[PDB]
Design an enzyme around this catalytic site. Structure first.
Site: not given
Lengths: 81, 1320
Positions: B8, B794, B937
């Site tokens: 990442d 949707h 992270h």
RNA sequence: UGCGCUUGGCGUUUUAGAGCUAGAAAUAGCAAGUUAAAAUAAGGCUAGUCCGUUAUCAACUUGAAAAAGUGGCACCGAGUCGGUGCUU
């Protein structure tokens, strides 16, 4: 007002201000007072903006808790106006 | 063992994780080095690296232009002194040596203490004959009598040191300096921009109204008086911008927020650049004339007086008016307000007249002080009007002298030399040499004129001698330096790499973007595609679709926008020859001019590059063609537009006007054409911050493979961050869209139902006014206040593509009001409401994508092409920067060739989108609370490796969409099934529901509430290997996210930057300040304050102590500042011995950069912020259940899920409150352990026991505030409800000295612990 | 994106612009003030009207530098990593 106006108003006050974590992370503003270890960072919160904490910490005066940071809370106060 | 690597990448954090074949992270025992007892440590193979963001070089350059400023302005005085020095030693032999020593004190000064004459007699007499230099500078112009050469220098050195701006090129003429002629230049530029609505100031007295002596408002309003628009108009703002006010260009351009511009500010040239970024660079020519006009206004404020010297005499009138008014003011205060005469005239601290003159207040801070004082006093008239006119007690050197051109300082200079030329011989000789010193301006195309040692220099010299303003013509090669100036300042294309790009205002570039926009419209064809260009673009600069709809589709065709070619329209109004522009033979002529008007701004180099074109036309066409420069740079090269070809025999631009494609090069050529790693990361289209992130991501990869025994991984999944994302801009953009869309419909929903912008954050409430208060499907109205029991739908369902943005949401009475199909709303629902969707559309209430998807049943439904495109939006990364990063890794890992010499792609570099993991989290409830710790992270990188590997193992035929390399591209029917589960594990088809993240689901939810079951084991029929197990693999993902050991490593960095704060402080008796020069001690000169600490040093020596001067062994922690670093690294012993240290051991001196880690007792860690302050170095690892609990409780209302899913979520928070008492229990134990801020922990525990009755989301959103006490890094303040807990910093850097110094790697696995207790 | 280049205006600092009076170390009472030089990251040299706040990084060893070199596997655990095999 706009955060960029805050970073400029404190750069004019001689304090060496970086806006960290500006990329899908929680934003924070690092004010390097002293230039010797003491850094007053203010991280963003979903409820309270970064400048709303700048006022709620420097609006009503120096907060009287440390010798070392006073010329600071004083100078940061003039920016709440 | 096989494995993969997740990553990442961010601007200040790089996360990583290692997964095996079973989607688990492994653990290994690593060797701990050093003098400690612990020689083994067990660490999981997951972690993150946190570093400070890379800084832009803007701050460095702005300091360099200031360094070159005082360097060259000094030499312009050295030029004058070196010229004068010979024949001047006759008069005085110590004049100059008293000037450069004028800063020193009496004790330090070697010469006499008076500058000009040396003695106290002739000096004070000078300051009374000429109290200001403008008094003498006028006397040296009017008198024909001989003057002292010392007084001649001081006048000339003044107007040369501060010479004035170079905004005007030649001499001053009425059409570049006069208000009347420059006002018309502004109105003419405003006109051309807007036609059939221009202003026409035919009968206006411009000068005697706009340039009068009144306030900034009494002159702008008096101007529009003889002009029956108003002050809020755009022209009224330009005049307000010119007169010095701070107008707002928001309401005139209808922006999202306010964009205020002020010409007097230090930020206009950048605050204005953000205005042209939105309104378009077409307005830059208009704002230029306003700045051009404003300086003519400020000059009349100064030059208030026909011969002699106007400025100095005007500065003398400003001097005399100051005296007669101060005497006027003193007598009033000394006889009407006898009190506070010392406060105004003596205090210096309260912004009186002393604060104005002696104590640091600006002209405005002093006006605002006596404004309530004068008005509260009689006889103050003729003074208050001056105070309001900003012309009261003005100091002769104020902020508005930036409007003084250097020709003004050249007239008084030439007048002084002329009337002293016949007295001194060298003044007659060097009459031009002194003149040229002032008038010279180092050109743009030359820049720094080094001899070879400068990374910024490019200029070549014709003769290698010394360069002066007079020999610049003979020494400097103007063509060779400018040729390299173009070669260096230009930046080549990416696609071609050595082909230079085109100016953004180039014709062939404007033609390109014109065709790229036109070639994708349809309601085209090559026939009149160019006829549109010829009839629409080539004549009207703005093609309002209104213009196209009736001036093309009526007149032509059959009765029933954006970028253009501005340079064509701009060049048209000049030469008035349309045959010239349309002719494709003169194209190379039209391009070199725009090239020359983009690079250079010089008077002589423009001609030398355009004199070749000085025979195409002559005079009246050329002078207008030169005084019109362009700015900006495009992104494409001419060789890409009209250069390359695929054998069709037609280039990219040729395809745009016939056989459209758009810039989606394929069917390959553009990419058909080794270094250092420092060079690969250097030339990537990314900010310097993300360039560091890529570099740490390459280093973290090379160390992960070394840990694995030099065994390269199977796959590497990459995720980036999209930087500079970061309220009043968002919720106002919704209102600005809602307001206009209502006015187009005209229905009064705002009048009937007012709403504040802060109330648009409700997804349903925003959808109300988005639908004009109507159902998206039924003709029936909507409830306003009963939105709770009314659902959001949707259009294209989640079963086909996970989209949670507004352009795919609707608001209806109920879910079943859209039809019975699993597709889009059927034709039944379309026919009834299609006419009203267009009513919504033309108002820009809904998008055209929202309209196309709502009316998809009219075109057959969701086509297989529409399905295959949905796979591209979920899988293909559109950013160019991410592709170049995966290239750096594929070229690093896969560097082996066979003996047939192909390439053994060992590793598959997978590039995923940031949405697939966030969708994976919010689907299977792996929620993320970033405020808890930095572990996310590592979790985002771990989940990236899972989604990346599980996709390529399940859908291998799509490797050419995210994996790097030349693979097979497949097509629509190559993987898209016909319908339902046809050819399910039969033919090559594989997809019907296009949401590729569905093979993780246990049960798929359709649009009509139906259920589509999926097995527990996911296979790949082409092979059969298990790719995901919804029973056993989800707990592994949950266990990996819950383990408490994550290699969190803050990157140690030596500080680099300024020496100290740039406040030149006054003098004081303390030795704390920094010497501004090697002799100017702050004890008698004043210096800099607060130096910044580069790094710290663990000193270990002996010092003198006690009255006996004995020795004592000590271990200290001295900080090495930036300024001290140059000498400390050259001679650390001779430098440390200057601080009282003796007998210094060099093998025990430790270099401790910032964020140096130190561990003490009970696993509590501290990071070294500097030599006298510490940071928190611990991380709080809450388990996975509390993160899922804190997120759901914080978002109790905005859950963004189906009511069948929100039921469990809301009941999970209401059946697990004890977690709240459990979460607070751990932060208490974690603060009583490592935080060591007991008094702050007193309040958070007392404030919690109070608010046990507050609502659920209240404590959650405030417990998330509590982690700020326990977060890693510097301490910060926070607020748990009302009790404001203030921070407790760590200024006691002493406990670190006797602890374990953790020298850890970038990945944290490789440690080297140095027990500092054995040091001494 | 990024990155370079030209120019100005204020600022701040120290000194110069002499202060006069009845007053004991406290301080009243008056007169004055509007700008000038110089520095504007310390400074470093190849002495250029040139560089000197960006980038670049753990430790240890080798090297001027560019850089190369240094850390066993597996299971069972999980309050920041353990505890538990195999091999040398």
């Amino acid at each position: 007002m706009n955060i960029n106006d805050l970073i400029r108003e404190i750069k004019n006050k001689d304090y060496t201000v970086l806006s960290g974590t500006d990329s899908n992370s929680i934003t924070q503003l690092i004010i390097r007072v002293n230039n010797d270890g003491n850094e007053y960072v203010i991280s963003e919160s979903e409820n309270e903006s970064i400048v709303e904490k700048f006022i709620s910490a420097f609006k009503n005066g120096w907060n009287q808790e440390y010798e070392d940071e006073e010329e600071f809370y004083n100078d940061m106060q003039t920016i709440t106006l | 063992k096989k494995y993969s690597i997740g990553l990442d990448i961010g601007t200040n954090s790089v996360g990583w994780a290692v997964i095996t074949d079973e989607y688990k992270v492994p653990s290994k025992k690593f060797k701990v080095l050093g003098n400690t007892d612990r020689h083994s440590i067990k660490k999981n193979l997951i972690g993150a690296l946190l570093f400070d963001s890379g800084e832009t070089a803007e701050a460095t350059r702005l300091k360099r232009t200031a360094r070159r400023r005082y360097t060259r302005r000094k030499n312009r005085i050295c030029y004058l002194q070196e010229i004068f020095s010979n024949e001047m030693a006759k008069v005085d032999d110590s004049f100059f040596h008293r000037l450069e020593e004028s800063f020193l004190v009496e004790e330090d000064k070697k010469h006499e203490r008076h500058p000009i004459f040396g003695n106290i007699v002739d000096e004070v007499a000078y300051h009374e004959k000429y109290p200001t230099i403008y008094h003498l500078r006028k006397k040296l112009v009017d008198s024909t009598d001989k003057a002292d050469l010392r007084l001649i220098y001081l006048a000339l050195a003044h107007m040369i040191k501060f010479r004035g701006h170079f905004l005007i090129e030649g001499d001053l003429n009425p059409d570049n300096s006069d208000v009347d002629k420059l006002f018309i230049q502004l109105v003419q530029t405003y006109n051309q921009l807007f036609e059939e609505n221009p202003i026409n100031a035919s009968g206006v007295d411009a000068k005697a109204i706009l340039s009068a002596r009144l306030s900034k408002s009494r002159r702008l309003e008096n101007l529009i008086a003889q002009l029956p628009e108003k002050k809020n108009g755009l022209f009224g703002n330009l005049i307000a911008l010119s007169l010095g006010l701070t107008p707002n260009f928001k309401s005139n351009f209808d922006l999202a927020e306010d964009a205020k511009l002020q010409l007097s500010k230090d930020t206009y040239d950048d605050d204005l650049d953000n205005l042209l970024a939105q309104i378009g660079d077409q307005y830059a020519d208009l704002f230029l004339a306003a700045k051009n006009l404003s300086d003519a206004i400020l000059l009349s404020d100064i030059l208030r007086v026909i011969t002699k010297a106007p400025l100095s005499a005007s500065m003398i009138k400003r001097y005399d008016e100051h005296h007669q008014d101060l005497t006027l003011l003193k007598a009033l205060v000394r006889q009407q307000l006898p009190e506070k005469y010392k406060e105004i005239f003596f205090d210096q601290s309260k912004n009186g007249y002393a604060g104005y003159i002696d104590g640091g207040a600006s002209q405005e801070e002093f006006y605002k002080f006596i404004k309530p004082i004068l008005e509260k006093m009689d006889g103050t008239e003729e003074l208050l009007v001056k105070l309001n006119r900003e012309d009261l007690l003005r100091k002769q050197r104020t902020f508005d002298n930036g409007s003084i051109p250097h020709q003004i300082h050249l007239g008084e200079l030439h007048a002084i030399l002329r009337r002293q030329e016949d007295f001194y011989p060298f003044l007659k000789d060097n009459r031009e040499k002194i003149e040229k010193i002032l008038t010279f301006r180092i050109p743009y195309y030359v820049g720094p004129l080094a001899r070879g040692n400068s990374r910024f220099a490019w200029m070549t010299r014709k003769s290698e001698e010394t360069i002066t303003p007079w020999n610049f013509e003979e020494v400097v090669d103007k063509g060779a330096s400018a040729q390299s100036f173009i070669e260096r300042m230009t930046n080549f294309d990416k696609n071609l790499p050595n082909e230079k790009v085109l100016p953004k205002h180039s014709l062939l570039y404007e033609y390109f973007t014109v065709y790229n926009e036109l070639t994708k419209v349809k309601y085209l064809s090559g026939e009149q595609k160019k006829a549109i260009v010829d009839l629409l673009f080539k004549t009207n600069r703005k093609v309002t679709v209104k213009q196209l709809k009736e001036d093309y589709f009526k007149k032509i065709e059959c009765f029933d926008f954006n970028a253009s070619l501005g340079t064509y329209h701009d060049l048209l109004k000049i030469i008035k020859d349309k045959d010239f522009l349309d002719n494709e033979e003169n194209e190379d002529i039209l391009e070199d001019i725009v090239l020359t008007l983009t690079l250079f701004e010089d008077r002589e180099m423009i001609e030398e590059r355009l004199k070749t074109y000085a025979h195409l036309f002559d005079d009246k066409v050329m002078k207008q063609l030169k005084r019109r420069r362009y700015t900006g740079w495009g992104r494409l090269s001419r060789k890409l537009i009209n250069g390359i070809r695929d054998k069709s025999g037609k280039t990219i631009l040729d395809f745009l006007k016939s056989d459209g494609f758009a810039n989606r090069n394929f069917m390959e050529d553009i990419q058909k054409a080794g270094d250092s790693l420092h060079e690969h990361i250097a030339n990537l289209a990314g900010s310097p911050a993300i360039k560091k992130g890529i570099l740490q991501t390459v280093k973290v990869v090379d160390e992960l493979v070394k840990v694995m025994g030099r065994h390269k991984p199977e796959n590497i999944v990459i995720e980036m961050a999209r930087e500079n994302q970061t309220g009043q801009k968002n919720s106002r953009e919704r209102m600005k869209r809602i307001e206009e869309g209502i006015k187009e419909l005209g229905s009064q929903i705002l009048k009937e139902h007012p709403v504040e912008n802060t109330q648009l954050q409700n997804e349903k409430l925003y959808l109300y006014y988005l639908q004009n208060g109507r159902d998206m499907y039924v003709d029936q109205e909507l409830d306003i206040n009963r939105l709770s029991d009314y659902d959001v739908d949707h259009i294209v369902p989640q079963s086909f593509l996970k989209d949670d943005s507004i352009d795919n949401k609707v608001l209806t009475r109920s879910d079943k009001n859209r039809g019975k199909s699993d597709n889009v709303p059927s034709e039944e629902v379309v026919k009834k409401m299609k006419n009203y969707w267009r009513q919504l559309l033309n108002a820009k209430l809904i998008t055209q994508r929202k309209f196309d998807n709502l009316t998809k049943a009219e075109r057959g439904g969701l086509s297989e092409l529409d399905k295959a495109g949905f796979i591209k939006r979920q899988l293909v990364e559109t950013r160019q920067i991410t592709k170049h990063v995966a290239q750096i890794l594929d070229s690093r890992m896969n560097t082996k060739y066979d003996e047939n010499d192909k390439l053994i792609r060992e590793v598959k570099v997978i590039t995923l989108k940031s949405k697939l993991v966030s969708d994976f989290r919010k689907d299977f409830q792996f929620y993320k609370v970033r405020e808890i710790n930095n572990y996310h992270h590592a979790h985002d990188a771990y989940l990236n490796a899972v989604v990346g590997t599980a996709l390529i193992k399940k859908y291998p035929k799509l490797e050419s969409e995210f994996v790097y390399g030349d693979y097979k591209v497949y097509d629509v029917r190559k993987m898209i099934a016909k319908s339902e589960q046809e050819i399910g594990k039969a033919t090559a088809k594989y997809f019907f529901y296009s949401n590729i993240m569905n093979f993780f689901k246990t049960e798929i939810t359709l649009a009509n509430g139906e259920i589509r079951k999926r097995p527990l084991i996911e296979t790949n029929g082409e092979t059969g290997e298990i790719v995901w197990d919804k029973g056993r693999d989800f707990a592994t993902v949950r266990k990996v996210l819950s383990m408490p050991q994550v290699n969190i490593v803050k990157k140690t960095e030596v500080q680099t930057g300024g020496f100290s704060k740039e406040s030149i402080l006054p003098k004081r008796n303390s030795d704390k300040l920094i010497a501004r020069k090697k002799d100017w001690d702050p004890k008698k000169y004043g210096g800099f304050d607060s130096p910044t600490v580069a790094y710290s040093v663990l000193v270990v020596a002996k010092v003198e102590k006690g009255k006996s001067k004995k020795l004592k062994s000590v271990k200290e922690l001295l900080g090495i500042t930036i300024m001290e670093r140059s000498s400390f690294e050259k001679n650390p012993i001779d430098f440390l011995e200057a601080k009282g240290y003796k007998e210094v051991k060099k093998d025990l001196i430790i270099k401790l950069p910032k964020y140096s880690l130190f561990e003490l007792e009970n696993g509590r860690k501290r990071m070294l912020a500097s030599a006298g302050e510490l940071q928190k170095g611990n991380e709080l690892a809450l388990p996975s259940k509390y993160v899922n609990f804190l997120y759901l409780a914080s978002h109790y209302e905005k859950l963004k899920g189906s009511p069948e899913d929100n039921e469990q979520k809301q009941l999970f928070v209401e059946q697990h409150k004890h977690y709240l008492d459990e979460i607070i229990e751990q932060i208490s134990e974690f603060s009583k352990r490592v935080i060591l801020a007991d008094a702050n922990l007193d309040k958070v525990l007392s404030a919690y026991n109070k608010h046990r009755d507050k609502p659920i989301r209240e404590q959650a959103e405030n417990i998330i505030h509590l982690f700020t006490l326990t977060n890693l890094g510097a301490p910060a303040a926070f607020k748990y409800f009302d009790t404001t807990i203030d921070r407790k910093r760590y200024t006691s850097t002493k406990e670190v000295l006797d602890a374990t110094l953790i020298h850890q790697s970038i990945t944290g696995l490789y440690e080297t612990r140095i027990d500092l207790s054995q040091l001494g």
